[PDB]
Design a protein around this ligand. Structure first.
Ligand code: C2E
Ligand code: C2E
Lengths: 374, 374
């Protein structure tokens, strides 16, 4: 087991270190601050002691390293010596739940840490080897994609709502399917809604049946009883519609043809636009936002996914060549470089769609360079 | 000291409750999920135990309150009847520090809870950071402006870097001065950096570069020691200065021939132009963007808070009229309409400096309709 890692140019502050080691835990300290930034991510969830007897290293960047997407993937911990530091003690606004005194009980500080160390041992115990496969990862396998799966697993099971904000065609629907399998309600229904063009009329027929409800009609939430309902591009939700989603959020009740009935649905969302501007402006209700933004997940873009662009092309060829019986089976080597350079605004989707176009053009078995430049 | 708060039908949690008012704590049990919201707001930084005997509470909404309005305003704690094996065990991703068994480890029990006294006893010390009755909002007071005060006061204390983006003359720096006053550093120096024509000469002379005296200007960083530094139009920085920003954000150094020093700088940023269009261009480094975009704060356009345009002029007249002893005292009822009509591409800076004109040009006590033909 390799969790537990303090960070300071000191490290010689061992009136508490071998006490953690002699109990059989070891330790891994950090000096500079450019290094743990790359460590805390890869390590995922761990206990990190930030020793601050002033000790030379900052306070602004100290607050940054704690929050720079290291919130959920790190349980915070701090250390100082009598140094009450009444001023910027506001650093404990970031749930550094317990400090570290100088009259240390070199055995009962283990009572605090050990309960927190035993708190982290909860997570990895029921899955101590998931990090490679994970049912193929469902898309790719890079640095931020290995990162993505590590988050997906520790945010899956908890039947809370999750905000999925990423670029267009990053696979918000793909991610929603992924965590659904881990949500223990996997078998139960899954519903994806392209809320972009719902245009109030039918979008409200789903919840409170307006001046028409054909026969069954059966609400999108009615079918999604024991399962999961997803709403993509949630910022495209009209004002009077956000309330009804907020209604089901605050009550858990939708109207069907054979009477109004309450259900229990884990509702997920998917964001495309800048979420901050939409809130200040008042496009979207912020009280509903806090319900969805319980936990955030960033779906990596292709610009952030270098050593992985190539894999997405090899396996997309397969499903598409087999589908349409094309006489091609590989790109040329120059076509490999030509794809890892493209902006990929549509990300996976554009690489997906454009490749499908190519397949239905080429007469050759190997895909050259010139034809697909646009 | 007056904390105690429980929540569930478990009045039959006599198996562990009454030992909490002895030792000396003011308990208060709740039952209905909706009331603790109104309760946990006014009670403040109390410690609340949330029972999860799988009795009633929709865990999706339970995780909400943990993050909604009760972050610092509540030290989390949970109780359950050994419901491990499944996802409920993983539901302790919501930072619930400690679990609760069932066969009361009494003499050990408090070691879980009571280790939060000295921590919670702190939270009560730095709570009334509201103060100043709110700096009059510094500017206006509409709907989209009412949003800004709260978000400013929240992201204020957290000494992290914050990205401040908006339109051309929205007053990005106007916001930077605000969280500086809600900071913990607070009184410490506030420094802003404009860079329309800063070149590479003087900006690199700020950090190191030339300047080899014993009081020669002294680095914009060194003067901002312990305070706050803002870089307006941050995205136009050349790489070699983006590096210097990233160098300082990862190390924290700046050289002076009179002796190199390290400083404590909360590096905020201000942006107007579309950031994303420049990211793909490879002009701005993404690693630096991370450190800066730790927190986003959006400044609204006039189009959406047009219900404040009538107020800005009223105060911009009041401050200018007394300043230059103008005979101007009020606007015409028709003059009000036209001010909401000039669109104002340059936002507040436009409306402010354009009033400087009319005030120093108009001769009547009431600014007539014929005046605003500009
Ligand atoms: N004194 C003065 N002259 C004006 C004004 N508006 C336009 N001009 C003149 O008209 C030229 C072309 O303007 P443009 O199409 O807007 O294209 C402009 C404009 O888009 C931009 N530019 C230069 N200064 C500014 C500025 O202060 N604000 C803005 N928003 N753009 C500027 O760069 C381009 C170059 O403008 P120039 O080299 O100056 O060449 C400008 C300028 O000589 C003004 O309000 N005051
Ligand atoms: N169409 C047009 N109008 C002109 C021109 N020159 C002066 N004006 C007008 O008369 C006002 C005077 O602008 P200013 O004295 O330069 O004071 C301006 C100027 O200092 C600056 N500015 C705005 N646009 C430009 C620009 O395009 N180029 C430059 N160099 N400065 C600009 O912002 C100030 C506010 O400009 P405004 O609100 O627009 O109001 C401007 C503008 O409406 C021109 O060449 N073309």
């Amino acid at each position: 087991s390799v969790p537990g890692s303090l960070v300071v140019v000191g490290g010689t502050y061992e009136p508490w270190l071998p006490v953690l080691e002699k109990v059989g835990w070891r330790c891994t300290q950090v000096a500079d601050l450019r290094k743990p930034d790359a460590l805390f991510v890869e390590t995922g969830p761990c206990i990190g002691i930030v020793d601050l007897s002033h000790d030379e290293f900052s306070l602004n960047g100290i607050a940054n390293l704690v929050s720079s997407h290291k919130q959920v993937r790190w349980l915070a911990f701090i250390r100082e010596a009598q140094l009450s530091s009444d001023t910027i003690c506001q650093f404990i606004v970031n749930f550094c739940i317990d400090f570290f005194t100088a009259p240390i009980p070199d055995a009962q500080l283990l009572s605090t840490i050990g309960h927190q160390l035993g708190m982290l041992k909860l997570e990895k115990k029921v899955w101590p080897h998931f990090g490679s496969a994970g049912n193929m990862g469902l898309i790719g396998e890079s640095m931020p994609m290995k990162r993505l799966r590590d988050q997906i697993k520790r945010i899956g099971p908890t039947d809370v709502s999750i905000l999925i904000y990423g670029e267009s065609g990053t696979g918000k629907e793909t991610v929603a399917k992924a965590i659904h399998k881990t949500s223990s309600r996997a078998q139960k229904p899954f519903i994806s809604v392209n809320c972009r063009a719902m245009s109030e009329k039918r979008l409200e027929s789903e919840l409170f049946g307006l001046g028409e409800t054909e026969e069954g009609q059966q609400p999108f939430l009615l079918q999604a009883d024991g399962g999961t309902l997803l709403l993509n591009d949630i910022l495209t939700l009209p004002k009077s519609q956000q309330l009804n989603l907020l209604r089901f959020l605050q009550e858990g009740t939708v109207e069907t043809r054979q009477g109004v009935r309450a259900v229990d649905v884990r509702i997920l969302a998917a964001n495309s636009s800048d979420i901050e501007k939409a809130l200040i402006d008042g496009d979207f209700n912020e009280e509903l936002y806090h319900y969805i933004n319980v936990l955030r997940i960033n779906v990596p873009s292709l610009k952030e996914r270098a050593s992985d662009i190539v894999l997405l092309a090899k396996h997309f060829l397969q499903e598409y060549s087999k589908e349409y019986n094309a006489q091609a089976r590989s790109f040329s080597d120059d076509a490999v470089r030509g794809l890892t350079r493209y902006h990929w605004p549509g990300n996976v989707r554009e690489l997906m769609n454009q490749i499908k176009r190519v397949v239905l053009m080429s007469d050759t078995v190997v895909l050259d360079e010139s034809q697909l430049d646009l």
